[PDB]
Amino acid sequence: RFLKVKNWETDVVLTDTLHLKSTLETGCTEHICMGSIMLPVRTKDQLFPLAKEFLDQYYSSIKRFGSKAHMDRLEEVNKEIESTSTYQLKDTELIYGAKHAWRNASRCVGRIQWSKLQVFDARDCTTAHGMFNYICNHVKYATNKGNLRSAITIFPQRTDGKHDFRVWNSQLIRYAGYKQPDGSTLGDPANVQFTEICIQQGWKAPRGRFDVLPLLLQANGNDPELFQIPPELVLEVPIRHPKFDWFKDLGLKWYGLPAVSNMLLEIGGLEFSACPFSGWYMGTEIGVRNYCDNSRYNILEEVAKKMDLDMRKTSSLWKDQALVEINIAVLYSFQSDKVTIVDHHSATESFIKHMENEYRCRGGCPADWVWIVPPMSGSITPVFHQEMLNYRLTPSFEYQPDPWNTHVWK
Amino acid sequence: RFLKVKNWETDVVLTDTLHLKSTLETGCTEHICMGSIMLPTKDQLFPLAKEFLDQYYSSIKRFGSKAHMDRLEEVNKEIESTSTYQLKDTELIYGAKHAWRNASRCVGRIQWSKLQVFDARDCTTAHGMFNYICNHVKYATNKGNLRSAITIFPQRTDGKHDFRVWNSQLIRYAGYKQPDGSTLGDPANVQFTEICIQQGWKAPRGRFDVLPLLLQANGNDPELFQIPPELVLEVPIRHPKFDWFKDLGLKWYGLPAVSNMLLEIGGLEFSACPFSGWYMGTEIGVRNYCDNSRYNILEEVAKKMDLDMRKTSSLWKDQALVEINIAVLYSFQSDKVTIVDHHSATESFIKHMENEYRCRGGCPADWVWIVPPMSGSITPVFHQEMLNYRLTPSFEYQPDPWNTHVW
Numbered sequence: 049r050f051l052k053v054k055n056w057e058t059d060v061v062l063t064d065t066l067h068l069k070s071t072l073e074t075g076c077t078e079h080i081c082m083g084s085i086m087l088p089v090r091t092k093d094q095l096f097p098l099a100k101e102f103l104d105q106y107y108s109s110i111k112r113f114g115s116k117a118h119m120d121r122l123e124e125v126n127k128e129i130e131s132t133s134t135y136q137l138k139d140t141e142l143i144y145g146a147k148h149a150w151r152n153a154s155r156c157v158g159r160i161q162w163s164k165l166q167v168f169d170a171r172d173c174t175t176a177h178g179m180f181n182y183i184c185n186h187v188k189y190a191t192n193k194g195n196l197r198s199a200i201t202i203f204p205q206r207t208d209g210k211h212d213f214r215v216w217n218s219q220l221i222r223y224a225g226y227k228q229p230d231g232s233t234l235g236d237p238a239n240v241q242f243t244e245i246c247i248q249q250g251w252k253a254p255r256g257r258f259d260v261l262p263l264l265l266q267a268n269g270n271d272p273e274l275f276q277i278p279p280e281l282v283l284e285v286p287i288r289h290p291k292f293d294w295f296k297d298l299g300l301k302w303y304g305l306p307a308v309s310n311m312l313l314e315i316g317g318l319e320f321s322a323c324p325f326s327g328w329y330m331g332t333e334i335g336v337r338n339y340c341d342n343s344r345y346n347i348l349e350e351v352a353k354k355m356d357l358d359m360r361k362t363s364s365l366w367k368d369q370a371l372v373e374i375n376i377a378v379l380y381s382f383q384s385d386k387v388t389i390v391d392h393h394s395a396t397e398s399f400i401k402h403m404e405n406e407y408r409c410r411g412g413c414p415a416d417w418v419w420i421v422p423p424m425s426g427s428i429t430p431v432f433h434q435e436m437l438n439y440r441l442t443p444s445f446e447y448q449p450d451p452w453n454t455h456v457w458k
Numbered sequence: 459r460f461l462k463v464k465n466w467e468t469d470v471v472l473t474d475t476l477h478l479k480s481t482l483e484t485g486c487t488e489h490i491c492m493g494s495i496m497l498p499t500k501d502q503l504f505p506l507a508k509e510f511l512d513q514y515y516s517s518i519k520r521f522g523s524k525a526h527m528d529r530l531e532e533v534n535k536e537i538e539s540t541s542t543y544q545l546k547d548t549e550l551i552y553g554a555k556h557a558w559r560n561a562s563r564c565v566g567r568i569q570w571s572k573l574q575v576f577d578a579r580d581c582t583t584a585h586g587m588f589n590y591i592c593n594h595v596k597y598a599t600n601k602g603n604l605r606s607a608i609t610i611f612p613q614r615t616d617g618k619h620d621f622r623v624w625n626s627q628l629i630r631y632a633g634y635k636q637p638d639g640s641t642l643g644d645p646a647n648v649q650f651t652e653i654c655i656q657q658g659w660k661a662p663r664g665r666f667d668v669l670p671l672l673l674q675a676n677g678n679d680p681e682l683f684q685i686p687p688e689l690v691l692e693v694p695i696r697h698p699k700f701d702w703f704k705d706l707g708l709k710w711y712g713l714p715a716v717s718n719m720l721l722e723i724g725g726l727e728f729s730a731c732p733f734s735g736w737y738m739g740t741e742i743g744v745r746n747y748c749d750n751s752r753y754n755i756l757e758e759v760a761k762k763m764d765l766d767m768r769k770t771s772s773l774w775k776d777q778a779l780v781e782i783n784i785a786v787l788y789s790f791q792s793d794k795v796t797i798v799d800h801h802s803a804t805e806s807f808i809k810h811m812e813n814e815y816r817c818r819g820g821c822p823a824d825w826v827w828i829v830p831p832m833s834g835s836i837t838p839v840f841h842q843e844m845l846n847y848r849l850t851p852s853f854e855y856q857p858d859p860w861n862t863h864v865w
């Protein structure tokens with residue numbers, strides 16, 4: 049079956065065949081679309097075919113499909129699974145797997161960069177202190193004094209489900225959130241629950257508006273442990289505006305390294321529950337969502353006032369005007385401090401070129417329109433006008449329940 | 459089987475049972491989502507009519523009554539004998555209002571129950587259609603205090619006597635491709651504009667020329683008509699601070715009136731059913747003016763604001779976008795012509811969704827279309843999960859008549 053996708057601005061029509069290799073389900077049915085829904089131990093039995101599928105893909109990618117090396121590896125893995133109920137990936141396969149999980153992430157607009165991921169193999173790690181060291185090296189490498197480099201650190205895979213490695217933080221670097229007795233929130237509201245857990249575990253919170261959270265690390269299914277990331281390794285950017293000298297006085301700043309640490313990486317049926325990865329920010333993530341979401345820092349009002357905009361009625365679009373200035377501020381500040389960042393126009397333009405390239409060389413590019421289109425100026429970016437097909441390919445990055453809800457305390 | 463929808467900004471969760479009544483296909487499968495794709499017999503007829511009449515009698519609190527049963531049998535006998543049937547005026551009104559209620563891509567459905575329905579099923583000619591249409595335009599415009607309305611022409615019979623309004627909207631601007639290779643006017647209408655020119659129309663070759671109606675009655679060839687200029691209300695666009703804005707020479711019409719969709723009620727198909735409400739600001743300022751394939755005026759406006767257009771990161775396109783939209787809203791409001799900004803419209807839709815979930819068990823909604831084309835996340839709908847499914851009565855897309863008409 050062939051599926052056509054059209055861009056309503058350029059009339060370019062693309063054909064998708066990659067979807068035929070989609071295995072996982074989407075949540076939608078022939079009767080209902082769940083496209084805007086945020087979240088819609090294996091058996092030896094259900095494992096070898098997953099391993100075979102992956103290895104076939106891997107060997108085909110290196111032009112050795114059907115080779116003796118390819119056949120020996122399948123036999124080696126099969127015997128290993130039958131013998132130990134699981135199997136170990138070769139370094140090369142792990143690298144290929146991680147890169148493809150990114151290439152297959154339908155909600156990621158930065159995929160033009162997929163082949164350039166630096167993979168850190170942390171499968172020999174056994175303790176939380178060991179995890180801390182690996183993570184510190186990841187942050188220092190990735191940050192690279194502001195010239196950000198994409199990277200992923202992969203800890204030991206799941207075995208029986210009772211010895212999982214987990215990074216309890218949602219991102220390696222985030223600001224604490226504190227709920228005050230009067231119901232207001234100091235800091236980032238998105239992290240109040242995790243902050244309370246950190247405090248309960250012993251963290252002495254400075255209780256400020258931008259306190260970098262400590263790492264809460266779980267190794268081999270044991271209870272998590274707290275670690276403070278060396279401040280000197282945490283690069284931050286004070287936010288100021290090119291024309292508004294009062295902007296800096298808002299006291300805003302943000303960390304330069306976005307590093308998702310709560311997702312699960314699936315490769316050949318194997319599950320890596322601790323696999324922190326990082327790239328670099330698209331400006332709107334900070335300027336639109338982190339600062340302007342009503343449930344986050346929510347700064348639109350204070351910014352609107354200082355600009356003396358007509359806030360008596362929404363039709364003056366005072367929110368929209370302030371929103372633009374704040375995003376100009378984030379981009380300008382990062383660029384001024386020589387810290388990598390990409391604006392939404394550049395990022396979406398690159399994604400379209402990446403997407404067309406993928407259709408040509410791969411036969412498709414699964415993409416989630418709801419997530420790909422930026423949270424501001426949607427239609428003046430090319431992705432708004434691009435029809436996309438969303439499906440799930442493996443290897444992949446998946447959501448997993450927050451650890452505090454499943455962990456068995458010892 | 460009982461799906462739940464959550465708003466990630468307010469944490470409010472709503473349960474959806476209404477989707478269990480859906481019949482039509484979405485285009486998606488368990489393996490692939492097509493949520494962003496723009497266009498994904500007597501035996502057939504009675505069940506459709508029955509499904510509809512049941513919902514109708516249920517709405518009037520007389521489900522299972524003799525009247526309900528009588529009507530059901532009357533229609534049943536009518537289909538067996540006439541191969542079709544006629545809706546009672548009450549059923550027609552209820553049907554059109556519900557096709558609007560069920561339009562998953564419409565953000566203004568909080569207004570659904572107030573629709574004015576014009577029954578034009580007694581129309582027989584294109585001149586009669588022109589007359590009904592002028593009356594709709596005048597009624598809906600109401601000197602600037604717009605009122606929602608729909609005019610329903612005769613239903614499909616054998617497919618060879620279909621009534622059709624060839625225009626995409628009752629009111630639009632023409633588009634002509636110039637020698638320069640460029641396009642004068644609205645590029646979206648270039649093809650229709652030529653079918654008119656070629657049909658007889660005399661284009662002023664201007665940037666904003668109100669197109670003529672191309673009306674098709676009973677399957678005959680369509681005919682042209684000029685909507686009384688005095689009935690076409692337009693708004694000159696000026697900025698409340700940039701006095702140079704008016705020099706761009708921009709204007710837009712006050713009445714948005716989709717005229718190419720198909721209204722399906724109880725199995726019956728109404729191929730000519732123009733409807734209208736009023737504009738959401740972004741429709742004109744963001745899409746009509748700034749889309750690259752439309753009037754594409756971002757550069758011109760950026761130049762007049764003297765913004766650094768050297769790098770994308772200065773966000774000049776974004777700043778210009780906001781100004782163009784403030785202008786559109788300011789102009790419509792200054793001229794007392796109804797219009798709604800995206801903040802107000804989305805806030806109303808959230809209220810509507812809640813009303814619908816508690817009084818109907820749900821509300822089909824297409825997030826890709828409901829979220830405004832600018833400032834997405836600062837509008838509440840962005841943070842609102844939505845379930846999309848098809849319910850009848852409904853408004854459907856249909857092939858352009860010129861690719862199907864036999865002259």
Ligand code: HEM
Pocket residue numbers: 146150153155156157158159161165198199200325326327328329330333390395419445
């Ligand atoms: C190099 C620059 C990169 C940019 C600019 C980029 C940009 C983005 C943005 C804007 C999002 C949406 C974030 C949100 O709204 O929460 C996203 C999501 C995502 N990206 Fe990328 N990304 C980059 C690198 C990476 C890397 C290194 C990986 C993995 C190796 C990755 C995997 C994903 C995944 C799985 C998601 C979805 C996460 C979720 O569902 O919450 N990205 N990316």
Ligand code: HEM
Pocket residue numbers: 558561563564565566567569573606607608716733734735736737738741798803827853
């Ligand atoms: C009174 C205020 C109304 C407002 C503010 C409103 C607003 C909207 C908007 C913004 C869209 C998207 C338009 C586009 O992007 O092309 C839309 C689509 C739609 N509306 Fe409404 N609407 C209103 C009244 C109506 C009425 C009176 C009906 C029917 C009787 C209706 C039926 C629909 C349908 C079927 C669509 C999708 C059409 C398509 O697929 O192109 N709307 N509406």
Ligand SMILES: N=C(NCCC[C@H](N)C(=O)N[C@H]1CN[C@H](C(N)=O)C1)N[N+](=O)[O-]
Pocket residue numbers: 306307308325326327328329330333334
């Ligand atoms: N650019 C990113 N972005 C993703 C991380 C930052 C993102 N702005 C964020 O806060 N994501 C969280 C909150 N919402 C997502 C969710 N699923 O709830 C995860 N990563 N990268 O690898 O370069």
Ligand SMILES: N=C(NCCC[C@H](N)C(=O)N[C@H]1CN[C@H](C(N)=O)C1)N[N+](=O)[O-]
Pocket residue numbers: 627714715716733734735736737738741742
């Ligand atoms: N507000 C509207 N809007 C719908 C019509 C105006 C809209 N701005 C428009 O241009 N729609 C066209 C172009 N894209 C849609 C499509 N299906 O391609 C139809 N209608 N109403 O009844 O109040």
Ligand SMILES: C[C@H](O)[C@H](O)[C@H]1CNc2nc(N)[nH]c(=O)c2N1
Pocket residue numbers: 083084085086418419420466840841842843844
């Ligand atoms: C309900 C809706 O799915 C939700 O708000 C989505 C929409 N699009 C998004 N897009 C991105 N990039 N990130 C998000 O967190 C979201 N949230």
Ligand SMILES: C[C@H](O)[C@H](O)[C@H]1CNc2nc(N)[nH]c(=O)c2N1
Pocket residue numbers: 056432433434435436494495496826827828
């Ligand atoms: C490809 C994509 O479906 C297309 O650009 C859609 C997106 N959302 C939209 N939303 C509205 N309201 N109107 C449109 O015309 C579109 N176009």
Ligand SMILES: OC[C@@H](O)[C@@H](O)[C@H](O)[C@H](O)CO
Pocket residue numbers: 217218238239240241242243310450
């Ligand atoms: O404060 C805890 C939250 O950050 C956490 O529950 C997130 O919602 C989750 O990790 C998804 O990012």
Ligand SMILES: OC[C@@H](O)[C@@H](O)[C@H](O)[C@H](O)CO
Pocket residue numbers: 625626646647648649650651718858
């Ligand atoms: O120029 C004719 C176009 O307006 C026409 O083909 C539309 O795209 C069609 O009616 C869908 O709205």
Ligand SMILES: [Zn+2]
Pocket residue numbers: 076080081082083486487490491492493
């Ligand atoms: Zn879907």
